[PDB]
Amino acid sequence: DLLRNGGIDKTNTKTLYTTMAPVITAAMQLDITESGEALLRWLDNNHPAGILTTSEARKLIIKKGQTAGDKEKLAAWCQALAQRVLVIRTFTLSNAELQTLSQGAPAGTITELYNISDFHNLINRCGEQAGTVLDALQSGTLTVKILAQALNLSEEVITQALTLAGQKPELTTWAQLAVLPPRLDLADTLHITP
Amino acid sequence: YRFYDLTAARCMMAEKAYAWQTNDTATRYIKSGAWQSNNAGLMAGESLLLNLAEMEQAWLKRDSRSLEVTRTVSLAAVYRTDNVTLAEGIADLLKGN
Amino acid sequence: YRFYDLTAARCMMAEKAYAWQTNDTATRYIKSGAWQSNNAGLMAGESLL
Amino acid sequence: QALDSARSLTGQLMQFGSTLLGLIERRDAEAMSELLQNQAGELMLSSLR
Amino acid sequence: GSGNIPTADNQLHAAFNLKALNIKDDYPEALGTTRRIKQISVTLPALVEPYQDMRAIFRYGGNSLPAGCKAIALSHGINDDGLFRLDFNDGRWLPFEGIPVDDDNSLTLSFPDATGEKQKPLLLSLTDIIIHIRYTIC
Amino acid sequence: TLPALVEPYQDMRAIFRYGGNSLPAGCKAIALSHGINDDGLFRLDFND
């Protein structure tokens, strides 16, 4: 009733998210409206099957009369939204980690939650300087020098751990950053280089 | 609670005045969901004045200058279209029917 | 959010009325940056006024 | 007149912005007030133990 | 029948370029560099049959005006605004307000249904058109 | 007021102006329209 009333959610993409965002981030008790804006993006990029695109959810939620069917479909959509909220809160991931993961992080099986937890571990190691790291990763300018500056590790260590599962110079995606924390932990507990 | 029912009918009077002065009864601006019983009706007037400002801007886009013409009807000529025109037509009527 | 889009077009109507009644279309007063998504648009009406 | 009509809505958006900052600030206090009680409960368990 | 007029199709139409009216030549330029039209009034001294209106439309040729501001009507033909109340305090502009006196108008004074009817001895006996243009030197 | 014999439907060309400079910007100069008890304005209201 609250999305159906109020202003009509705009038919243009990237405006659909920012108009649907505050009521969804109220309904999930998330922190920031932009976090709830990127949550619709993260469920829209990937989701288990049969769940509505948010454009299709907007098309459904403004109808003449909602049938006996295709109203539990919208309920399943909101259940998937709440499940992704629970994914977000069970790792305590920030706004920037979310918006890095919002553009296509696979979640829905265990070996993908392993990767999300490793990425969250790396960004917690980045710490206060994680904002420019995820800003460089959202652009195409993340290098080994700035990421070694953030982690307070040497540049000649991260470029070694990159050679393991070789992606070595082209750090453009977050999935190549999930590889780093097991390699760095194993090169810490054995006092050797990667 | 009983003041919301006062001001919502004012919003409806504003909408009916808008629908009368510009003949647009298909569109609507004062929509439902202004009261929410989870909030005990808190922030209803914000939504109502949002809809009022939407309707005011729709007015100011639709409100412009317009042509204004008067026309004088000589009613003796339109009774003359039936040729039982007024100068005899009122004069021959003498009855208590 | 959807009230800012209402009042910004009012500011633009005021600017176009100013540009029509005094023929000064080169100057501009209602400039951008009134909304800021870091602030979630807080203090936009201050800048507009 | 259009300037006054715009000034009315910009003052109204000032009111909306002040109300919104009050609601954000107050929500943000209540969330910490609930966080402290959840922490006090799971700390009271350890003290009893 | 002739569209794109400057007896058009079934109506009569008037056309003037106000550059040829010499508004700039009227007063010296040292007074003010810009002159803008404020109010236009029309006077049509024709022999009118009693209790009969007059059919006339008056319109701006170019497009730089507000929406309804560019066109005005006419009612009876002696010093008649298209309005019925005449107040400069209205924030609605007068029709033809803000027009620069340079160019961009074929001065449309239309006359619908100029053919054989009660309007034909009216517009036949109209010996002259007289306009009254109030403008602002700023 | 300029009581001259005017040909019908003809305006009158006249400008009236203050010599010194202590007035507001446009206040110092006035125009004239037809020449019998005519302000440079068209509405005459002291409430402005």
XYZ file of C-alpha atoms in Angstrom:
575
model
C 0.000 0.000 0.000
C 2.838 2.399 0.711
C 4.679 1.771 -2.556
C 1.385 1.685 -4.478
C 0.452 5.055 -3.021
C 2.833 7.973 -3.003
C 4.587 9.069 -6.148
C 4.686 6.677 -9.081
C 8.068 4.981 -9.208
C 9.797 6.295 -12.307
C 9.944 4.110 -15.413
C 13.571 5.053 -16.111
C 16.241 2.817 -14.638
C 18.551 4.281 -11.922
C 15.534 6.418 -10.999
C 13.412 3.381 -10.161
C 16.011 2.445 -7.550
C 16.249 5.899 -6.014
C 12.476 6.303 -5.796
C 11.804 2.802 -4.467
C 14.794 3.040 -2.109
C 13.534 4.916 1.008
C 10.453 2.793 1.607
C 12.450 -0.422 1.125
C 15.195 0.781 3.462
C 12.492 1.666 5.982
C 10.849 -1.740 5.610
C 14.113 -3.624 6.151
C 15.460 -1.280 8.885
C 18.641 -0.674 6.944
C 20.917 2.211 7.776
C 21.119 4.536 4.762
C 18.691 5.085 1.885
C 21.551 4.564 -0.565
C 22.239 1.155 0.975
C 18.630 0.219 0.291
C 19.064 1.691 -3.179
C 21.958 -0.642 -3.910
C 20.141 -3.606 -2.342
C 17.537 -3.587 -5.115
C 20.443 -3.560 -7.560
C 22.088 -6.522 -5.857
C 18.929 -8.571 -5.940
C 18.275 -7.454 -9.519
C 21.700 -8.463 -10.852
C 21.385 -11.943 -9.367
C 18.756 -13.866 -7.451
C 17.348 -17.396 -7.284
C 14.965 -18.230 -10.077
C 11.398 -17.057 -10.573
C 11.867 -13.883 -8.517
C 10.795 -10.619 -10.095
C 12.953 -7.963 -11.634
C 12.313 -4.731 -9.735
C 11.039 -3.147 -12.948
C 8.631 -6.071 -13.213
C 7.867 -5.606 -9.509
C 6.989 -1.969 -10.212
C 4.823 -3.056 -13.144
C 3.061 -5.577 -10.910
C 2.646 -3.298 -7.885
C 0.735 -0.734 -9.946
C -2.146 -2.786 -11.327
C -5.914 -2.586 -11.599
C -6.489 -5.566 -9.320
C -3.935 -7.962 -7.872
C -5.077 -11.521 -8.503
C -5.077 -14.570 -6.252
C -1.954 -15.482 -8.164
C 1.041 -13.116 -8.662
C 0.687 -11.580 -5.190
C 2.543 -14.347 -3.417
C 5.067 -13.833 -6.211
C 5.597 -10.296 -4.930
C 5.675 -11.736 -1.410
C 8.433 -14.137 -2.484
C 10.267 -11.145 -3.939
C 10.114 -9.403 -0.572
C 11.231 -12.602 1.181
C 14.257 -12.696 -1.117
C 14.870 -9.041 -0.257
C 14.784 -9.899 3.449
C 17.137 -12.824 2.868
C 19.628 -10.503 1.191
C 19.225 -8.064 4.106
C 20.134 -10.971 6.355
C 23.189 -11.687 4.156
C 24.209 -8.050 4.641
C 23.735 -8.025 8.393
C 25.337 -11.399 9.085
C 28.692 -10.124 7.794
C 28.199 -6.498 8.977
C 29.235 -5.152 5.590
C 29.319 -1.393 5.072
C 27.776 0.829 2.421
C 30.881 0.781 0.223
C 31.334 -2.990 0.482
C 27.661 -3.325 -0.417
C 27.857 -1.072 -3.464
C 30.940 -2.927 -4.631
C 28.993 -6.160 -4.230
C 25.759 -4.612 -5.537
C 26.866 -4.841 -9.163
C 26.918 -8.599 -9.440
C 28.141 -10.505 -6.406
C 26.910 -14.119 -6.517
C 25.211 -15.198 -3.298
C 23.005 -18.236 -2.975
C 25.392 -21.059 -2.220
C 28.051 -21.617 0.416
C 31.141 -21.290 -1.791
C 29.967 -17.773 -2.689
C 29.481 -16.757 0.939
C 33.078 -17.881 1.461
C 34.107 -15.319 -1.151
C 31.920 -12.585 0.348
C 33.412 -13.258 3.786
C 36.951 -13.132 2.378
C 36.192 -9.830 0.645
C 34.758 -8.437 3.879
C 37.896 -9.564 5.713
C 40.131 -7.785 3.192
C 38.158 -4.540 3.359
C 38.260 -4.650 7.166
C 42.028 -4.967 6.871
C 41.963 -1.886 4.639
C 40.089 -0.064 7.379
C 39.959 3.732 7.297
C 41.437 3.886 3.796
C 38.924 1.376 2.383
C 36.839 4.145 0.827
C 39.427 5.048 -1.785
C 40.092 1.335 -2.370
C 36.489 0.588 -3.242
C 36.280 3.874 -5.149
C 39.271 2.801 -7.245
C 37.746 -0.653 -7.659
C 34.456 0.823 -8.862
C 36.550 2.722 -11.400
C 39.326 1.083 -13.393
C 42.209 2.521 -11.389
C 42.878 0.084 -8.533
C 46.602 -0.679 -8.547
C 48.833 -2.733 -6.297
C 50.540 0.413 -4.975
C 47.407 2.039 -3.547
C 46.152 -1.269 -2.152
C 49.506 -1.914 -0.497
C 49.307 1.599 0.919
C 45.893 0.776 2.366
C 46.685 -2.634 3.876
C 50.021 -1.332 5.279
C 51.795 -4.222 3.584
C 54.624 -4.110 1.087
C 53.906 -3.841 -2.619
C 56.236 -6.803 -3.199
C 53.925 -9.061 -1.149
C 50.488 -8.420 -2.597
C 51.885 -8.739 -6.122
C 53.156 -12.163 -5.051
C 49.826 -13.312 -3.611
C 48.240 -12.113 -6.862
C 50.450 -14.559 -8.792
C 48.831 -17.410 -6.879
C 45.599 -18.091 -8.811
C 47.077 -15.868 -11.471
C 45.248 -12.639 -12.234
C 48.422 -10.808 -11.635
C 48.335 -7.146 -12.860
C 44.667 -6.574 -13.770
C 42.814 -5.875 -10.497
C 39.474 -4.698 -11.871
C 36.983 -6.820 -9.956
C 36.276 -7.618 -6.325
C 36.479 -11.362 -6.991
C 40.236 -11.065 -7.410
C 40.411 -9.407 -3.994
C 38.711 -12.317 -2.229
C 41.744 -14.454 -3.102
C 44.099 -12.356 -0.947
C 43.133 -12.996 2.762
C 43.778 -16.788 2.813
C 47.133 -16.246 1.095
C 48.070 -13.427 3.465
C 46.991 -15.408 6.538
C 48.944 -18.446 5.399
C 51.999 -16.307 4.686
C 51.606 -14.848 8.168
C 51.265 -18.089 10.139
C 54.263 -19.430 8.255
C 56.727 -16.529 8.284
C 57.316 -16.678 4.523
C 56.440 -14.489 1.567
C 53.555 -15.400 -0.793
C -7.604 11.852 14.229
C -10.706 13.945 13.842
C -8.693 16.799 12.318
C -7.352 14.578 9.539
C -10.940 13.953 8.445
C -11.394 17.705 8.347
C -8.391 18.489 6.187
C -8.750 15.525 3.813
C -12.140 16.775 2.682
C -10.508 20.165 2.113
C -7.970 18.457 -0.124
C -10.909 16.828 -1.908
C -12.632 20.204 -2.328
C -9.410 21.561 -3.820
C -9.255 18.590 -6.186
C -12.879 19.034 -7.259
C -12.291 22.744 -7.856
C -9.267 21.845 -9.982
C -11.341 19.268 -11.853
C -14.074 21.812 -12.489
C -12.008 24.790 -13.607
C -9.847 22.657 -15.901
C -11.997 19.819 -17.223
C -9.708 16.976 -16.114
C -11.673 14.438 -14.096
C -9.573 11.489 -15.273
C -6.465 12.668 -13.446
C -6.291 12.674 -9.665
C -3.874 14.155 -7.204
C -5.147 13.680 -3.644
C -4.520 9.945 -3.427
C -4.892 7.481 -0.577
C -2.312 6.226 1.890
C -1.995 9.605 3.592
C -3.090 8.068 6.881
C -1.133 5.047 8.096
C -2.261 3.268 11.245
C 1.247 1.982 11.912
C 2.297 5.591 12.373
C -1.019 6.524 14.052
C -1.486 8.949 11.200
C 1.759 10.826 11.820
C 3.002 12.637 8.695
C -0.322 12.732 6.900
C -0.314 16.460 6.238
C 3.108 16.250 4.621
C 1.737 13.807 2.051
C -1.449 15.825 1.589
C 0.497 19.021 0.954
C 2.783 17.111 -1.411
C -0.306 16.206 -3.421
C -1.572 19.792 -3.143
C 1.712 21.133 -4.508
C 1.628 18.603 -7.355
C -1.856 19.864 -8.182
C -0.731 23.495 -7.873
C 2.110 22.957 -10.330
C -0.208 21.084 -12.694
C -2.422 24.163 -12.466
C 0.422 26.612 -13.151
C 1.472 24.603 -16.190
C -2.125 24.395 -17.405
C -3.102 27.924 -16.304
C -2.358 30.458 -18.996
C -4.087 33.290 -20.773
C -7.207 32.491 -22.752
C -9.538 34.016 -25.302
C -12.588 35.784 -23.882
C -15.495 36.401 -26.262
C -18.965 37.725 -25.520
C -21.958 37.022 -27.741
C -25.272 38.866 -27.833
C -28.382 36.825 -28.616
C -31.382 38.647 -30.011
C -33.924 36.106 -28.774
C -36.624 37.473 -31.093
C -34.619 36.067 -34.015
C -34.223 32.593 -32.530
C -37.960 32.523 -31.868
C -38.243 33.649 -35.506
C -36.562 30.379 -36.540
C -39.920 28.827 -35.598
C -41.730 31.899 -37.115
C -44.005 32.118 -34.036
C -41.683 34.873 -32.809
C -41.782 36.791 -29.571
C -43.770 39.950 -30.381
C -46.871 37.857 -31.042
C -45.660 34.818 -29.115
C -45.877 36.343 -25.664
C -48.766 38.609 -26.676
C -51.249 35.895 -27.660
C -50.692 33.934 -24.447
C -53.579 34.876 -22.184
C -54.713 31.997 -19.991
C -54.599 30.494 -16.516
C -53.396 27.109 -17.717
C 12.952 13.658 -2.541
C 9.872 14.135 -4.650
C 9.222 17.545 -3.079
C 12.642 18.846 -4.112
C 11.691 18.179 -7.733
C 8.566 20.217 -7.120
C 10.266 23.267 -5.671
C 13.252 23.298 -8.044
C 10.951 23.774 -11.013
C 9.344 26.636 -9.088
C 12.779 28.198 -8.734
C 13.192 27.700 -12.482
C 9.827 29.364 -13.157
C 10.951 32.298 -11.018
C 14.202 32.482 -12.979
C 12.391 32.389 -16.325
C 10.011 35.117 -15.159
C 13.023 37.203 -14.136
C 14.648 36.517 -17.501
C 11.496 37.554 -19.327
C 10.630 40.743 -17.463
C 14.224 41.986 -17.557
C 15.819 40.711 -20.758
C 18.807 39.002 -19.116
C 19.057 35.407 -20.295
C 22.856 35.323 -20.060
C 22.865 35.588 -16.277
C 21.587 32.763 -14.105
C 20.780 32.494 -10.449
C 19.218 29.104 -9.682
C 22.375 27.041 -10.089
C 23.082 23.364 -9.529
C 24.492 21.605 -6.489
C 21.402 22.307 -4.396
C 20.857 18.584 -3.925
C 23.778 16.588 -2.538
C 23.456 12.826 -2.234
C 26.012 12.719 0.571
C 23.565 14.732 2.645
C 20.537 12.912 1.158
C 19.434 16.299 -0.083
C 19.403 17.922 3.353
C 19.749 21.721 3.161
C 18.624 22.076 -0.427
C 15.957 24.678 0.244
C 18.450 26.891 2.047
C 20.583 27.039 -1.096
C 17.547 27.503 -3.333
C 16.275 30.407 -1.247
C 4.471 36.927 -7.527
C 6.218 33.854 -8.937
C 9.157 34.678 -6.675
C 6.865 34.607 -3.636
C 5.296 31.369 -4.887
C 8.749 29.810 -5.109
C 9.799 31.236 -1.735
C 6.814 29.560 -0.072
C 7.813 26.093 -1.272
C 11.483 26.614 -0.477
C 10.540 27.572 3.079
C 8.334 24.493 3.187
C 11.280 22.369 2.090
C 13.344 23.992 4.842
C 10.664 22.758 7.244
C 10.810 19.287 5.663
C 14.589 19.226 5.929
C 14.575 20.225 9.589
C 11.895 17.627 10.347
C 13.821 14.978 8.410
C 17.062 15.728 10.217
C 15.199 15.488 13.514
C 13.761 12.107 12.546
C 17.129 10.791 11.328
C 18.825 11.979 14.527
C 16.102 10.487 16.706
C 16.049 7.126 14.881
C 19.801 7.100 15.141
C 19.596 7.623 18.893
C 16.952 4.907 19.334
C 19.013 2.362 17.400
C 21.953 2.941 19.733
C 19.634 2.760 22.737
C 18.494 -0.679 21.591
C 22.054 -1.767 20.749
C 23.161 -0.932 24.295
C 20.406 -3.080 25.794
C 21.196 -6.067 23.579
C 24.829 -5.703 24.639
C 23.827 -5.380 28.297
C 21.794 -8.582 28.091
C 24.506 -10.645 26.440
C 26.979 -9.209 28.956
C 24.702 -10.034 31.890
C 24.770 -13.656 30.725
C 28.554 -13.713 31.142
C 28.371 -12.055 34.556
C 25.843 -14.645 35.771
C 27.980 -17.408 34.309
C -8.933 29.415 -49.926
C -5.356 30.220 -48.914
C -3.537 29.075 -45.810
C -0.246 30.702 -44.741
C -1.860 34.052 -45.176
C 0.847 36.737 -45.239
C -10.702 36.237 -47.735
C -7.940 33.862 -46.634
C -10.015 30.660 -46.532
C -13.379 31.923 -45.304
C -11.939 34.581 -42.969
C -10.181 37.931 -43.233
C -6.622 38.385 -42.022
C -4.310 41.348 -41.402
C -0.503 41.417 -41.391
C 2.172 43.978 -40.495
C 5.817 43.857 -39.518
C 6.292 46.238 -36.588
C 9.823 47.031 -37.798
C 8.064 49.020 -40.531
C 6.077 50.918 -37.883
C 9.234 52.846 -36.779
C 8.965 52.611 -33.014
C 12.696 53.307 -32.699
C 12.316 56.426 -34.860
C 9.589 57.786 -32.570
C 11.770 58.865 -29.636
C 15.535 59.487 -29.285
C 17.757 56.588 -28.291
C 19.348 58.548 -25.421
C 16.127 58.068 -23.442
C 16.275 54.272 -23.298
C 18.021 51.532 -25.252
C 15.154 49.009 -25.071
C 11.435 49.420 -25.703
C 8.929 46.689 -24.866
C 5.201 46.429 -25.511
C 2.970 46.557 -22.430
C -0.658 46.676 -23.619
C -2.413 46.585 -26.987
C -5.930 47.971 -27.363
C -7.940 47.986 -30.595
C -10.627 50.411 -31.791
C -12.767 49.454 -34.810
C -15.195 52.301 -35.581
C -17.749 50.518 -37.764
C -21.521 50.842 -37.971
C -22.752 48.030 -35.723
C -26.312 46.744 -35.663
C -27.509 47.126 -32.038
C -26.913 44.208 -29.652
C -24.355 42.482 -31.885
C -20.813 41.438 -31.026
C -17.846 41.727 -33.386
C -15.745 38.768 -34.520
C -12.033 39.558 -34.401
C -8.889 37.751 -33.266
C -5.544 39.491 -32.775
C -2.359 37.495 -32.531
C 1.451 37.608 -32.393
C 3.248 36.022 -35.330
C 6.447 34.812 -33.699
C 6.984 32.565 -30.692
C 8.810 34.022 -27.696
C 5.797 34.818 -25.503
C 3.996 32.784 -22.804
C 1.396 30.174 -23.723
C -1.859 32.078 -23.955
C -0.224 35.501 -23.950
C 0.523 35.530 -27.691
C -3.114 35.713 -28.829
C -5.977 37.984 -27.801
C -9.647 38.130 -28.724
C -11.981 41.056 -29.368
C -15.545 41.742 -28.272
C -17.162 44.878 -29.697
C -14.579 47.181 -31.265
C -14.074 50.446 -29.418
C -11.010 50.528 -27.108
C -11.631 46.950 -26.020
C -9.118 44.698 -24.337
C -9.573 40.975 -24.773
C -10.168 40.894 -21.026
C -13.185 42.240 -19.191
C -11.337 43.559 -16.138
C -8.270 45.710 -16.796
C -5.840 45.613 -13.870
C -2.063 45.885 -14.109
C -1.742 44.473 -10.573
C -2.449 40.955 -11.856
C 0.659 38.795 -11.966
C -0.791 37.201 -15.032
C 0.826 39.213 -17.801
C -1.195 41.315 -20.147
C -1.474 39.844 -23.637
C 1.379 41.027 -25.870
C 3.492 42.043 -22.875
C 7.256 41.795 -23.166
C 7.410 42.062 -26.966
C 10.603 43.778 -28.139
C 9.849 46.451 -30.715
C 12.383 45.157 -33.239
C 10.872 42.340 -35.284
C 9.425 38.783 -35.366
C 5.737 39.557 -35.872
C 3.530 39.506 -38.901
C 0.821 41.437 -37.072
C -2.079 38.993 -37.115
C -5.481 40.654 -36.800
C -7.825 37.871 -37.886
C -11.521 38.202 -38.726
C -13.378 34.868 -38.748
C -16.228 34.377 -41.243
C -15.799 37.441 -43.438
C -18.260 36.024 -45.997
C -21.849 37.055 -46.728
C -23.682 37.337 -43.401
C -24.317 40.014 -40.765
C -20.517 40.431 -40.502
C -20.155 41.493 -44.146
C -21.788 44.976 -43.926
C -19.952 45.328 -40.613
C -16.477 44.778 -42.059
C -17.525 46.564 -45.251
C -18.467 49.732 -43.355
C -15.289 49.525 -41.248
C -13.593 52.570 -42.742
C -10.338 52.195 -40.766
C -8.601 50.002 -38.219
C -7.237 51.855 -35.184
C -4.945 50.239 -32.628
C -3.560 51.585 -29.348
C -0.169 50.195 -28.345
C 1.156 50.991 -24.879
C 4.856 50.257 -24.490
C 7.616 50.691 -21.930
C 10.918 52.489 -22.516
C 13.408 51.086 -20.025
C -2.101 69.863 -19.998
C -1.373 70.915 -23.600
C -4.557 72.335 -25.161
C -3.705 72.153 -28.863
C -5.831 71.278 -31.878
C -5.102 67.582 -32.406
C -5.967 65.660 -35.550
C -8.195 62.745 -34.423
C -6.488 59.472 -33.456
C -3.017 61.007 -33.116
C -0.686 60.903 -30.127
C 1.478 63.811 -28.980
C 5.270 63.663 -28.742
C 6.535 65.218 -25.517
C 9.150 64.345 -22.904
C 9.354 66.040 -19.507
C 12.461 65.747 -17.397
C 14.294 66.933 -14.269
C 17.517 68.834 -14.878
C 19.519 67.943 -11.788
C 20.451 64.561 -10.345
C 19.181 63.709 -6.867
C 16.211 61.531 -7.845
C 15.880 57.751 -8.366
C 16.891 56.126 -11.644
C 13.816 56.335 -13.829
C 12.005 58.804 -11.588
C 13.723 61.893 -13.022
C 12.112 61.687 -16.473
C 8.498 61.277 -17.561
C 6.820 60.878 -20.932
C 3.577 62.276 -22.328
C 0.805 60.688 -24.370
C -1.947 63.028 -25.564
C -1.830 66.356 -23.734
C -4.769 66.975 -21.432
C -4.084 66.259 -17.723
C -2.023 63.202 -18.609
C 0.413 61.458 -16.321
C 3.222 59.526 -17.943
C 1.621 56.450 -16.399
C -1.647 54.855 -17.424
C -2.821 53.887 -13.936
C -2.663 56.596 -11.269
C -2.390 55.107 -7.780
C -0.561 56.660 -4.840
C -0.581 53.283 -3.051
C 2.247 52.028 -5.277
